[PDB]
RNA sequence: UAGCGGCGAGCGAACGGGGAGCAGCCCAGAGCCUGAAUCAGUGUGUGUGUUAGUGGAAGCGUCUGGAAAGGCGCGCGAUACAGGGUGACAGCCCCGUACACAAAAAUGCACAUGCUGUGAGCUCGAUGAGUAGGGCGGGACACGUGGUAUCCUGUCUGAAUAUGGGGGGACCAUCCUCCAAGGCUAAAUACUCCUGACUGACCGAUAGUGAACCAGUACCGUGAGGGAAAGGCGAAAAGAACCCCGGCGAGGGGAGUGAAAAAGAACCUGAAACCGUGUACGUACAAGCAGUGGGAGCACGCUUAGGCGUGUGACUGCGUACCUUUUGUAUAAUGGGUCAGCGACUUAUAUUCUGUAGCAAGGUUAACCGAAUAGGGGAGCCGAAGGGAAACCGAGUCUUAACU
């Protein structure tokens, strides 16, 4: 019932939370 | 050539390479072909991804998200986006050479004598602007499918002949090929035969 | 214009799941999955159309081979006791004496040996 | 003879390809075009004369010549083009006339290639050895 | 739109009666004096556009 | 094309020709005759529109069917068979259409005319100075400073003035042509916020406007701004009285309406993925792209029992998905959860080639006119001759002093 922002822009993802898991090792 | 009148059963002397050539198929297909060509209007157009209503704003980053790269959301591809060879108003006219329209009306001529489909009378007037009259007359003379070309400018006949759709009635000059081939019986004034022959050479 | 494909996609999807009945799962109600099973099924069945005339063969060779060891005579002896005496008789025709007929396949044999002899 | 009995010509209408229409077309998922080049790709393709970055020929090759504008205002006449004109004398505005030459026109020269037969008077024009003996056979009378 | 010209193709060939183009020679410009005159002098006429790079030729100029 | 051009990529005329349309005037100044043309304004009158409207032809019977406009008969109208609606497809049921008319009042446009203003014509003159031109720096001309004409001017200068001056693509001479440094001017031309009529080999609800629906809405964003989804009961609500279970529920079963309720409002048709119930067969000692070839048995139909079909498939031979990319993939390389819908070699103009058709040493028109896919229009374009850088020569020509 007006139940959109589901997966509008997928901001899921747009949080884009920090990545590379301390993992520079793959140098 | 000599053409048989239906009312008087006189004769009446024409032109051979008129009104007795060889049926060239293929030039008169390909006349009633750019003639039906020029009766298209080509009104129609859709939308680009240019022309949709939108902005020129990428949906979501280029990478990181999980998601297919996209630029636009006028993209072709999606959902109420642009056509992608959406199309203008175009002409569909083609030309026909002279030679070539004048060589299928002869061909075509000759071919609804060969055929029968043709019908030659001095005159052919109705006296009053009835279409009633019309259709009585058209029935004495067994004809319901007919062109009328007529070598001056009747308008009673074009009146009476006007809510008839099985009838159509033409001046000399405004013949065409495709109605002389659309309509089952021709009948030709004998000056609408000589001017015929005058333009036909 | 605007040819919309509903209906062609649609009868164009059903003559393959047609085909897939009696398949395992997807196989018989998806069309991706059913498509890429039934060119497999096209290619063993022409593969298939070739190896039944191996494997017949092979099944009647070791047929008359047990019944021409049972009468005291090895398949390759019979079969060249045959070519000598020219019996033309082909391996199906003689698995199935072989079978029914016991009384000529022995006639048979004997011919052989007298052919070998 | 009717609007559905008409047909064309054998051989005049051809159907024409359509690309990345199935296998059995043969014009399948890459259309003609092989695979992951420059040539492959929408609008790929090199321009005009491009040879790589090779000197192209028309750029190893020197220059040579001008354009006379005298040769744009010359013009050649055949002997079959005599008769076309009217009166039996030939000018330069009577050949403009016949619509032979062009309005710009000065010059003409008239050259033995046709023939001719009846007497043509040419006024005011070059001609060759080989038209001059063609005309005079004729009866004409080359002048000025 | 109609086709343009490359002019210096235009500048550089001219038509010949059966469709071959003809060209001046190259390597007749400088640098004469360790040239040798025989060399030159069958480097002064006009030769005719070669089979193989008759292509390119038409492509570049494709009013004639 | 001529040209311009790191002479590259590319830019790209003009003269001239065919057409549409055509219109010329005034002040730099005095007089003479004086209001004379025209224009403007303002009235009136007439006509023609516009802004409401009016009339407008002609059909019955029977069969099927819920319903006739359908079928079968028999008529009639038509300057009206454009179109739309009506319980299924209507020339004659309705609204209209053709045609014929119509405005108290306002207003447009034409003429005509009144009034106001305006000046007309003739003669003799005058003939646009910090201007033309120049130097420097830039820009525009197709023309990128080049040998660069012409135009504009930021800066510094600076003429003659009809016996004079400008241009004719450096420049000079001759000749031709025109008169700058003050102005005005209809048409042919460009466009469509909007209105009316009509049309479509344009779409038919993931299409077409973003929007067929209370859409630039809901919603998002501080904001500029972004920006949806969502159509259809039936001919007519006749939209289910009443009864029953249930919570004075929801929901359902009747009954009733209706042609139809597997049209009941979560409402035309209702596919697939997906999830169930029922029936038949198979399956709990059996190893893998799940099929294919063989094949027992079981169940079910037909049949003259002949045995065929149909479903299942014990056991058994063989058998490591598809796409893409690759020297090469079962590959433990990519891609795809599945279904349904959409989704990619087009269009325009030039050009070459092939085919085909027309005419043929000729072929063909474009603009435009034209009521008009005709016909006219041959301006032009290609071709029938080439060679040469070119003048030029010409079935030859160029090279060269000249070619065996
Ligand atoms: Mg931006
Ligand atoms: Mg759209
Ligand atoms: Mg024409
Ligand atoms: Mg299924
Ligand atoms: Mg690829
Ligand atoms: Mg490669
Ligand atoms: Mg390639
Ligand atoms: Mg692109
Ligand atoms: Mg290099
Ligand atoms: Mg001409
Ligand atoms: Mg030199
Ligand atoms: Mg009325
Ligand atoms: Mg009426
Ligand atoms: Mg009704
Ligand atoms: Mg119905
Ligand atoms: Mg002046
Ligand atoms: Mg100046
Ligand atoms: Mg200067
Ligand atoms: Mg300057
Ligand atoms: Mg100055
Ligand atoms: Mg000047
Ligand atoms: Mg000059
Ligand atoms: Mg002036
Ligand atoms: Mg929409
Ligand atoms: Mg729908
Ligand atoms: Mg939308
Ligand atoms: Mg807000
Ligand atoms: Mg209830
Ligand atoms: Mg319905
Ligand atoms: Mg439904
Ligand atoms: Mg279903
Ligand atoms: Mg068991
Ligand atoms: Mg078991
Ligand atoms: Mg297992
Ligand atoms: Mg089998
Ligand atoms: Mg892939
Ligand atoms: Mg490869
Ligand atoms: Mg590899
Ligand atoms: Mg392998
Ligand atoms: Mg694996
Ligand atoms: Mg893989
Ligand atoms: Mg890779
Ligand atoms: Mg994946
Ligand atoms: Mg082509
Ligand atoms: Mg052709």
Same mark, same amino acid.
């Given at each position: ?27 | ?9 006189? $004769? ?9 050539? !060889? ?10 072909? $750019? ?23 990428? =949906? ?43 060589? $299928? ?12 489909? *043709? ?9 009053? =602007? ?14 319901? !499918? ?17 809510? *008839? ?11 065409? =090929? ?13 000056? $609408? ?9 | ?21 009696? /398949? ?6 998806? /069309? ?25 063969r092979q099944?009647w060779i070791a047929r008359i081979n047990?019944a021409a060891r049972?009468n005291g005579i090895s398949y390759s002896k019979f079969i060249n006791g045959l070519k000598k005496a020219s019996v033309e008789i082909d391996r199906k025709i003689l698995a199935?004496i072989a ?5 000529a396949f022995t006639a048979l044999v004997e011919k052989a040996k007298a052919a070998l002899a | ?8 010509? #054998? ?6 390809? @359509?690309?990345?229409?199935? &296998? ?26 491009? #040879? ?6 028309? @750029? ?20 079959? %083009? ?8 030939? %000018? ?8 032979? &030459?062009?309005?710009? &026109? ?16 040419? @006024? ?10 063609? &005309? ?6 080359? #002048? #000025? | ?30 640098? +004469? ?22 292509? +390119? ?8």
């Amino acid at each position: 019932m007006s139940g959109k922002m589901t997966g509008i822009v997928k901001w899921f993802n747009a949080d884009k939370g920090f990545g590379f898991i301390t993992p520079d090792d793959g140098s | 050539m000599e053409l048989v009148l239906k009312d008087a059963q006189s $004769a009446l002397t024409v032109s051979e390479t008129t009104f007795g050539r !060889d049926f060239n198929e293929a030039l008169v297909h390909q006349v009633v072909v $750019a003639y039906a060509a020029g009766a298209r209007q080509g009104t129609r157009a859709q939308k680009t991804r240019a022309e949709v209503t939108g902005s020129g704003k990428k =949906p979501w980053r280029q990478k990181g998200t999980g998601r297919a790269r996209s630029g636009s959301i006028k993209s072709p591809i999606w959902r109420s986006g642009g056509v992608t060879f959406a199309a203008r108003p175009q002409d569909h006219s083609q030309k026909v050479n002279k030679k070539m329209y004048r060589g $299928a009306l002869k061909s075509i001529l000759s071919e609804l004598v060969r055929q029968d489909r *043709l019908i030659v009378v001095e005159k052919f007037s109705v006296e009053a =602007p009835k279409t009633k009259l019309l259709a009585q007359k058209l029935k004495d003379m067994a004809l319901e !499918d007919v062109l009328i070309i007529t070598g001056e400018l009747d308008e009673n006949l074009f009146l009476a002949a006007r809510n *008839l759709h099985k009838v159509d009635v033409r001046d000399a000059t405004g013949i065409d =090929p495709v109605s002389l081939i659309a309509f089952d019986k021709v009948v030709m004034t004998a000056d $609408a035969v000589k001017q015929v022959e005058e333009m036909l050479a | 214009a605007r040819v919309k494909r509903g209906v062609i996609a649609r009868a164009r999807h059903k003559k393959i799941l047609k085909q897939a009945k009696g /398949y395992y799962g997807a196989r018989s109600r998806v /069309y991706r999955v059913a498509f890429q099973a039934v060119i497999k099924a096209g290619q063993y069945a022409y593969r298939d159309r070739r190896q039944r005339k191996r494997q017949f063969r092979q099944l009647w060779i070791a047929r008359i081979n047990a019944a021409a060891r049972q009468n005291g005579i090895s398949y390759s002896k019979f079969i060249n006791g045959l070519k000598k005496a020219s019996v033309e008789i082909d391996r199906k025709i003689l698995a199935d004496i072989a079978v029914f007929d016991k009384v000529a396949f022995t006639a048979l044999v004997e011919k052989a040996k007298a052919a070998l002899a | 003879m009717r609007l559905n009995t008409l047909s064309p010509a #054998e051989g005049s209408k051809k159907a024409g390809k @359509r690309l990345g229409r199935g &296998i059995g077309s043969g014009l399948g998922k890459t259309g003609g075009r092989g695979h992951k080049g420059q040539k492959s790709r929408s609008g790929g393709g090199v321009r005009r004369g491009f #040879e790589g970055g090779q000197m192209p020929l028309y @750029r190893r090759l020197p220059k040579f010549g001008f354009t006379s504008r005298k040769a744009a205002i010359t013009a050649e006449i055949r002997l079959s %083009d005599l008769a076309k004109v009217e009166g039996g004398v030939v %000018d330069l505005n009577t050949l403009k006339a016949a619509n032979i &030459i062009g309005i710009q &026109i000065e010059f003409a020269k008239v050259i033995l290639a046709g023939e001719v037969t009846t007497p043509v008077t040419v @006024r005011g024009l070059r001609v060759t050895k080989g038209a001059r003996a063609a &005309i005079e056979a004729a009866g004409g009378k080359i #002048e #000025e | 739109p109609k086709i343009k010209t490359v002019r210096g193709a235009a500048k550089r060939f001219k038509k010949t009666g059966k469709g071959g183009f003809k060209h001046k020679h190259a390597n007749l410009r400088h640098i +004469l004096t360790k040239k040798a005159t025989k060399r030159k002098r069958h480097l002064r006429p006009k030769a005719m556009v070669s089979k193989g790079d008759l292509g +390119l030729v038409i492509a570049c100029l494709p009013y004639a």
